[PDB]
Each structure stands twice: as structure tokens, then as C-alpha cells.
């Protein structure tokens, strides 16, 4: 399919949207309604992650989360602003948004000419520290600088399940926005924090992965060009 969403633990579910160059986000079925991590890549996509929403829950969705600045995790937020969902952010992920979404935009579009050119959405509702949702059951916290300068950890304590967005994930990647030598000092600065963790899901490539896909990327990024 374009798009799946699957059961991992419990209310929480992980998205697979193949649409473009595959990114993975998460849905937490709660019991006043549904927040969703990572808006997906356009309104087009959110869309259709509602469609497949409404095949499990009648309940609203409350807000989403936009992770980073990036495309790929606030491309949605228009549709998610046009059915009454709050998009939630760091203040750092939306001042940044505001002015490097043009920027992000066209270069998205460098490598995928068939992606849209989006007007600016951004966040409504925005956190100057670390943030709970869902009756402190989705845990956002920043960690430093990594992938983007912004990036943030979404935790889910009673499935141990971690998501880092587009920190997290098995193959390198080309590393444009990057912090290469700062981006093992925050993963290590996340594995000091000792959370427990059985899945922790990537936001590119395959998802599903245990705790040892932060030693594998850590890895990979310590070997890098200007690491
Ligand atoms: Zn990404």
C-alpha cells in the first residue's frame, strides 16, 4: 500500500508512508483522542493517513507533532490545521520553520521535482522546554543537535518504545543540515538518560529495530565525512 499503519504495542502505531522517499512516523490511540508524531510528507499524504485513522478510532485527532522543520515530518500540517488537529512543535523547530521552510522546500524539490511547492503552516502550539501529551504517555524531549539542529526524541514509557524522527535510522544519508560531530555526542547524551527501550523506531528505512539501531547509526555517522 501507499501508506500502512500498524499496531507495534498497545495504542501505539507506526506509519509507513512510501509516498516519495518512505518515512516512518507514529500514531498514539488515546482515550480522548489521537495524537499523531511526524505529520507526513504533504496534505495529500496526512490525508490519507486520517482515511486510515477513521478505520480504527472514531476519536479526534487532538494535534501532531512536527519533529524537525523538515518536509518530511511538517508537509502535512496544512490538512491536520484544516480539520482542527493542533500542530506542535519546539519553539526552535518553528522559528526555524519560519525561515528556512522555503529553503527546505526547494530542496526537497532539488531531488524530487514531483514534490509540491508548499506554502508555510506552522505550529500553533509551541514548548520552550521538553513536552507531554496523552496524560504524560507521549514524552517529547530534546537531546541536541543531530540530523537537523532541532530534532527531537518522542518516548512512549509504558510500550518502551523510542522515535527520533529522521535521527534515527539504518543507512546514512547524505547530510546537508547535519551536526556530524555533534550527532554522536546527543546520541550518547540519549543513551544516558537510560530509558528503557525495547523498539525503537526509525523514521527512514525498515521501522521496526530494537534498542541497538542507536549503537548502529552512532556507528555509521562516527565514520563519516567531517565526523
Ligand atoms: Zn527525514
Given at each position: 500500500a501507499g501508506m500502512s499503519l500498524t499496531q507495534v504495542s498497545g495504542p501505539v502505531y507506526v506509519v509507513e508512508?512510501?509516498?516519495?522517499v518512505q518515512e516512518n512516523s507514529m500514531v498514539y490511540f488515546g482515550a480522548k483522542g489521537v495524537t499523531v508524531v511526524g505529520a507526513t510528507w504533504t496534505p495529500d499524504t496526512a490525508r490519507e493517513l486520517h482515511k486510515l485513522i477513521k478505520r480504527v478510532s472514531?476519536?479526534?485527532?487532538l494535534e501532531v507533532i512536527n519533529?524537525?522543520?523538515?518536509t518530511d515530518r511538517a508537509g502535512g500540517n496544512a490538512y491536520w490545521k484544516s480539520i482542527g488537529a493542533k500542530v506542535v512543535s519546539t519553539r526552535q523547530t518553528r522559528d526555524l520553520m519560519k525561515s528556512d521552510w522555503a529553503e527546505i522546500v526547494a530542496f526537497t524539490r532539488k531531488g524530487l521535482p514531483e514534490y509540491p511547492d508548499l506554502p508555510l503552516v506552522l505550529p500553533n502550539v509551541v514548548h520552550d522546554g521538553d513536552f507531554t501529551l496523552q496524560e504524560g504517555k507521549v514524552r517529547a524531549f530534546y537531546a541536541g543537535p543531530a540530523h537537523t539542529p532541532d530534532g527531537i526524541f518522542v518516548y512512549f514509557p509504558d510500550e518502551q518504545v523510542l522515535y527520533g524522527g529522521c535521527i534515527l535510522k539504518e543507512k546514512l544519508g547524505n547530510?546537508?543540515?547535519?551536526?556530524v560531530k555533534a550527532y554522536p555526542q546527543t546520541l550518547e547524551r540519549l543513551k544516558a538518560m537510560k530509558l528503557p527501550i525495547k523498539t525503537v523506531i526509525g523514521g527512514?528505512?525498515?521501522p521496526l529495530h530494537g534498542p541497538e539501531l542507536i549503537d548502529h547509526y552512532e556507528a555509521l555517522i562516527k565514520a563519516a565525512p567531517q565526523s
Open positions: 508512508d512510501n509516498y516519495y472514531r476519536k479526534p485527532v519533529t524537525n522543520y523538515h547530510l546537508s543540515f547535519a551536526d527512514h528505512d525498515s
